[PDB]
Amino acid sequence: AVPAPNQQPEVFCNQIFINNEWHDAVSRKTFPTVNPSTGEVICQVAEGDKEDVDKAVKAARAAFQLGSPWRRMDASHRGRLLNRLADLIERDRTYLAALETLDNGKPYVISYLVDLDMVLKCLRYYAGWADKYHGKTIPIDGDFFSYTRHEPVGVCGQIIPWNFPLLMQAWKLGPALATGNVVVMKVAEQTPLTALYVANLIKEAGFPPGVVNIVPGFGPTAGAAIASHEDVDKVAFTGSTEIGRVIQVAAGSSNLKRVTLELGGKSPNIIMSDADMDWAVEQAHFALFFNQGQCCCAGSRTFVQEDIYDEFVERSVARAKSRVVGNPFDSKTEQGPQVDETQFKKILGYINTGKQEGAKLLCGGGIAADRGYFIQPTVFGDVQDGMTIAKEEIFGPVMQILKFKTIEEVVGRANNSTYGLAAAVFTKDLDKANYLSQALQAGTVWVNCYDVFGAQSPFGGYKMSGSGRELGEYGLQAYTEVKTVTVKVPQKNS
Amino acid sequence: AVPAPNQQPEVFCNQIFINNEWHDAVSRKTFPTVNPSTGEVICQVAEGDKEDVDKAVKAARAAFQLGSPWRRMDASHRGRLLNRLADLIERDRTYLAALETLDNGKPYVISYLVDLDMVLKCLRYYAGWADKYHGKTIPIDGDFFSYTRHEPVGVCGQIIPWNFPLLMQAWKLGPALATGNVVVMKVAEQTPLTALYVANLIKEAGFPPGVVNIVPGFGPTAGAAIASHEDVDKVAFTGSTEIGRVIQVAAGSSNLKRVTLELGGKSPNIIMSDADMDWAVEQAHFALFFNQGQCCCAGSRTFVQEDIYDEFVERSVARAKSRVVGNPFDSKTEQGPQVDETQFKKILGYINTGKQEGAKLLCGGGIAADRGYFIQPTVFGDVQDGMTIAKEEIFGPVMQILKFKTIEEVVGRANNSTYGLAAAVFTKDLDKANYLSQALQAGTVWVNCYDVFGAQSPFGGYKMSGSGRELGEYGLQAYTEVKTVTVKVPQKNS
Amino acid sequence: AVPAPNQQPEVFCNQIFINNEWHDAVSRKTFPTVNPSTGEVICQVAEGDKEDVDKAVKAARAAFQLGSPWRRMDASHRGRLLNRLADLIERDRTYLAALETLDNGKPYVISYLVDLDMVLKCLRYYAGWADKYHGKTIPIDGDFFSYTRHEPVGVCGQIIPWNFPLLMQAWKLGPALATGNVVVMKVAEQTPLTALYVANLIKEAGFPPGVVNIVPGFGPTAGAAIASHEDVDKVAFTGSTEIGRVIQVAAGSSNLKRVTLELGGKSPNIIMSDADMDWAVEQAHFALFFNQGQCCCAGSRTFVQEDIYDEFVERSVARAKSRVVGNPFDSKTEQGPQVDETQFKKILGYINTGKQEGAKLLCGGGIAADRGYFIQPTVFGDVQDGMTIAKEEIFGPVMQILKFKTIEEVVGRANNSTYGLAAAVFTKDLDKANYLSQALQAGTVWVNCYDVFGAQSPFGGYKMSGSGRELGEYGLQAYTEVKTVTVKVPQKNS
Amino acid sequence: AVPAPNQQPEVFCNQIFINNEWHDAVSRKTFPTVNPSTGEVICQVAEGDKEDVDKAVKAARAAFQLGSPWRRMDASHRGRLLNRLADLIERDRTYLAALETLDNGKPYVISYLVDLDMVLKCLRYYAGWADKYHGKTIPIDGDFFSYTRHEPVGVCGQIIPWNFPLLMQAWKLGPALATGNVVVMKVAEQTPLTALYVANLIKEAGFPPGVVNIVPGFGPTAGAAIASHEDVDKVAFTGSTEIGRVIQVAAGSSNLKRVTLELGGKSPNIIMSDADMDWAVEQAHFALFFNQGQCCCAGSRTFVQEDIYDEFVERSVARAKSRVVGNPFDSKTEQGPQVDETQFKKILGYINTGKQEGAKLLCGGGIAADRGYFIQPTVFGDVQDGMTIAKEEIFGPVMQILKFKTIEEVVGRANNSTYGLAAAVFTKDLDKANYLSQALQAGTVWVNCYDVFGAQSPFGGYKMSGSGRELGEYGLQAYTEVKTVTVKVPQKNS
């Protein structure tokens, strides 16, 4: 049940947001952001660089000074401000969902019902944590009173991706602001607009100036400037595994800022022979093709027990052949365009590679429209662990189906990856679900479902899929600096 | 492996323990403790009364005075003392095991491998908690520093049953001592001996005098004096639901002391048609017959799905007839005698009451030896929910087997009870297991097992099976008094 | 900026509230509620009794059924509902504040700025807890997966007092509803009206029918009915220690329902000779006289070190004489009337008692007006520990000032009470502060302040001031029932 | 009351420890470890490099395989093993104490009463955590059951320093083993002996082969090997801020392993004018001179209020001159030799800068014995913030005394450092205490004490003193990898 979208939403924010004001870049340069459905430019956006990041960091540092409005504010009041922000986002939900669809390509129905819903749920979840993340009083030996203070880490540099622009902004801001930090945020060049607008709403909500600063721009410039900045206390980066390597080195090279990363994956989706066939087929489709395949936790390795392989495959092809690709503003559209021409071309490449390395093309495999970055839903069968398409993140509507015989075999094959973001298991058997959930080396294990996120439950990678967790109580850990205070007392008693 | 037992072990402690010293009752009166296996007196025990509880409580109060050795001792040291006590108990394991069997009647092999293992594991678990039950520092509104101290509740009265004499002592002392409380404990007249020997070890381990005081005696006398005492801060009572209510009333009429209760049960053991038959049969036998059926969480309503009912009943009667009843010191014996004559008569009465209401007596039904309180492993088939034996706690080797058709049915029938201590579900199905464990109104739900206890996991009743939880972190809650300290500061900052 | 009050607000709700609907008593009976300022009837209210409670409990039980809208609702959505209730209460703040003052007698400026603000803060605080009170996964011995579910305790009977009608309602509803329980609430006959109007807002907020039910009526009838009810799972009572006793006995005689109590106190306010004199004198006046002295935690024993005694007393008496008594709607008013004629008389009796037993009456001591129930702020000096006014809760504007010499002395005297709700220490010295805060046997110790409450920090009694805690994370404990699920697994690994 | 030392303890272990066996370096190269009191070689030690590290990592990885004895072991049993290891270390206490003094130089009385006591206390503390670090059950949105498993991070590389050889080993092993990780440990070339002996005790204790592996060697070889190893999951480094940056860059350039750092400091010790003079002077002495000044948290900037400055300086100089230097095994010795030639020369270098830059050398200043790396207790007065000795970590017995006026001024000065490991405040004033503890940007703030460690309380740096915390519950975090398991259920209910 969804409000009709404005199919050409106006843009009101496209600059640098520092101290609750809008700036051009110091260089006065701009860059274009494109509508992926048409390939035409939406507008130019302020192209931030090191000098701009420098202004934002100083503004945040100022806001963080002992005795500032933000530092003195009651924790409960930080929660009031987060709740007010969620309220304003709801007020503007229909507009934001459309703007999201315009800049990103995802279907408006999904932006509205999924993304913006999750944004509201995330911010309202963290609003509640603001005054509940207690330190401890500690029964240390001797005549001492010892306790810990949970203080903010300080100035947090936050780098976010283009696949879920508003949701990722929320995943970062929620825990950060709940714990009284200040942020310098770099948004993706492919999708800067919606986070920029939310910045205006952060102003409207009443956050003191400098508490949230947003610098659009490129990675080799704006992003690198953040990771390497000498007065940034903490960096949180979501993006490719390859770039997460650059970030941590830059943190080592600079001021030894604390680092968390959310990176790529090649998550195994395991279908046992006792699985509910219909449910598992639809879920495996969802697991892979959701959001044009542009999900770090995409179920891009579908392991199917040989007894049910043939039928599972037949039903999966039928579903993929009937997945509607088209204008993201049409309510019937299941899959919009890929985010840009670079991804468009990289995905086509992987398709070309999968055919060459002997995988069996079951459907799709081509461009799905002559304008915009639309790709046919694609399904490869008889995929082998050694193939490129079975090892590398494609980040597109390309499905991999593999065949296995035993539960021991599959555990080994599933875990034989340098990735470890997520995994799933479909089975009716209690013992099989418990065996696999324990044995799978992944940050999240779904059982008879996929892509089930809740602001209550932590998310993050094992292995090279990242480190640290977002969401849940766990999402607060990376944003807290712990101070022990130990006080001599006349005579300690229990 | 089990050392050969001393079948008539010497008794060294048979009086009232106060201030690490042994006292006669102030009346000098004593009572007999009997060997359940023969019906003969083992020895006399000091019969503690109100005047003896008063002495015990005054001693405990003095030990709890601010600045006392017990109050000043580091938390980690209370932990060291508990580990030392466990070490001492293990040193005297073979002796304690045999004395447990002599006074209580359970098989020596079980006293040694189960009861004593569990006593050691309980004490060592709680030793670990001594210095880890943190208070909080709290982001309170305004210019204040606010925190909580987790202090001991104070003088705790503890009344334990006769079914697991040593283990029940450990479940009480573990948490209370870990958190720095002092104890006045009343032990069952049926089984005073092992608990009094452990008082010797407590002194030997170095607990300051008055920290643990033990008063053997009767219920309406010593036990009542504890529950009704004006200077006792907290009572923990394990026993029947009936006496559980005397305790809460006595607390309310006196000083409004804090109360926790571990009462009776009539726990449902649910076997679905897709259970592993062999496993389900043995586990169901175990679930009911363990400890001569003297378990508050005995699976005394065995619900079996109609499709497998017949096979289940045949296998269950075969197993009940094979159960060896004899001298608990004989290694072949699976079942010792009931704890005393009162229990002996009562259980026999219940069997009669069941042969009345048209339940099929399938085996046993009668006395099993002309010497001692031995009762034949009894099975009732085709039991109906309205029958007295399907409603009331028997506390003897009497198994009730009921039939059911659907999952909705068994849920309602299982839940239709004023008891809710435990429950079990046997099934291979993920969803059935999850549906039932959520739906069942019980303090503990075991899946594909029964009587699985861990010091790590809490245990306690829903409904009239008690309130509060023992074991786990949760067992600390009832023994902690929370103090908020809120301090005016010059200027609060995050 | 306090909006001008309507001195005669309209009454919209005066019936029994069940299933989100307004009912007359089955008996059709009503009782008058009085304006303690004029002594004249405001209106009549439905007089609920056993049969009305029974209907409410049934409605509550029905709303609690597995699969019901309240049981199935996302934890996070319970939070949304609590947040909406707060918004509506804030929308109607001016009205509720005026209504509170009409029925209770407290100054309108205080109803508006203190009570209402605290209600909003309590509700918004607990809103945040709804989806954050996690159960545990537990490293139990053996090949098992063991975890705890934190389930709602169930049908909760809440009996609340007249001193803080709206605030006490919120302190009870917040934790109960955050944790998914259902409520049958008995409001005070002196002050039923504001609670009933809030019921209307509960409906407007969208809480399912039967989740909150309110039965206005008397104590020995509606109150006792809830306490003794066989289908009420938990009872929370705030009132006199004497009635707390009846509540506990009732719980024990019936179904062993869980019980928490917030009872009376005789809280010591300790002023060291090195305290800021001006601040100490204002805070001491506030501590005793706030809300016409009708606070469970009133600083009703003011201990003042002998070096500063004569000056403190002189300043205290001066402050008491200038305290403005009169019309609670008049901004100039500091002190309204006591709540009713029963309290009025009780306070006059204690005043006479004080004079009779030799306490030095320094000011007031009598009736301050003819209409209503106004009492002169009264100060006794040279009070001794053995005096009745030094021991018993007066619950009126009657201050006790006692002289002490040493910090070791004052600890014993402060602690020599059957009460232990709160205490305070005024001193500039770090060591004196830490010494006293540790040594004082009280649920809350304020340092250099008094009556500092935060939804974040727990509050409750030691000894006979009650058991359990309200506010903070601690306030969730009594509203939770712990279920252990222990599942057999093929092979346990770390 | 310290048992007599063996002043020339025999060495039993001097090789590489892998799989509970002793190995020569693959290259058979060795290196001398020297007694710093005499400058004479104690013995040769296996010089491990990359190849030996690879052997140790493979051993660790194997011990960590699902289904291995270490993986299947009950968590409570891991605790039993830690406690057993502690008992063994206690058995060998005088021996390890003497060998520590022999290889490191610290006085045997301190090694015995401080280092080994703290090793015992740390290991016993973490033993208790083994089975108590619960994951969560989470009330996620929707029809799901969601929980977290707290799993081990896996193969942990641990690089420890030479200043507290045994204690640092325990600080790393306690948490890592309590949570069921496996370790590859690199010990400092200056002090490899006591840690290798503890490896024998780990074997004796019962730890499976490969769970703990120790590779002595140099930093740029063995250490860099661990940090860059593609199969090490986590690294914990304690050492110079300079090296810590190498560690974080290796992490980033290899496998993105998780990293924690405990680095250097320049901690401020703040003496307010109302401090207790005698106490403050003796504690300022201890704060800096402890462990030959070889403490990361040394109070190396002693800020003293101008009103008591002169008296404080005179008293400090007097105490410094009386500080006994010499043979660490002599009971009168307060200060042993520095650890090695490199440190010796670097300290003398800093003393030279201090003189060159115009700091008043008040006592000491050079070599204190003709044999061994003994340096005189040195005090510089009237130090200025800009001086090299006020800024850089000296890590020797060189005291900086600075003069200040206001509390605001000194906060700004103390916080003007890229270090933030610890700090201390001396004052009798409640408000001053609270103001400073909050305001100081340090990982630990001591009040009226210094160098007060407890296993219960976390320790770690702000800014460039490190990241992550050791000790306490917090110390378990870096050693846990969190897994979310989200399960579809028939129907979610509260």
Ligand SMILES: O=C(NCc1ccc2c(c1)OCO2)c1c(Cl)cccc1Cl
């Ligand atoms: O729509 C859902 N997930 C889609 C999804 C996929 C990848 C994502 C995501 C949501 O959030 C960030 O990454 C979804 C579902 Cl089917 C069930 C429960 C909760 C949720 Cl949120």
Ligand SMILES: O=C(NCc1ccc2c(c1)OCO2)c1c(Cl)cccc1Cl
């Ligand atoms: O106005 C306050 N207390 C008044 C008060 C007294 C007794 C009470 C109460 C509020 O709530 C229940 O009992 C108050 C103050 Cl002065 C400082 C901080 C927070 C608060 Cl809430």
Ligand SMILES: O=C(NCc1ccc2c(c1)OCO2)c1c(Cl)cccc1Cl
């Ligand atoms: O002797 C102590 N500290 C000395 C010390 C200094 C630096 C350290 C350390 C111990 O452990 C690691 O770093 C000490 C003191 Cl005076 C009081 C309580 C507890 C402790 Cl352990």
Ligand code: NA
């Ligand atoms: Na775009």
Ligand code: NA
């Ligand atoms: Na007996």
Ligand code: NA
């Ligand atoms: Na009234």
Ligand code: NA
């Ligand atoms: Na050496």
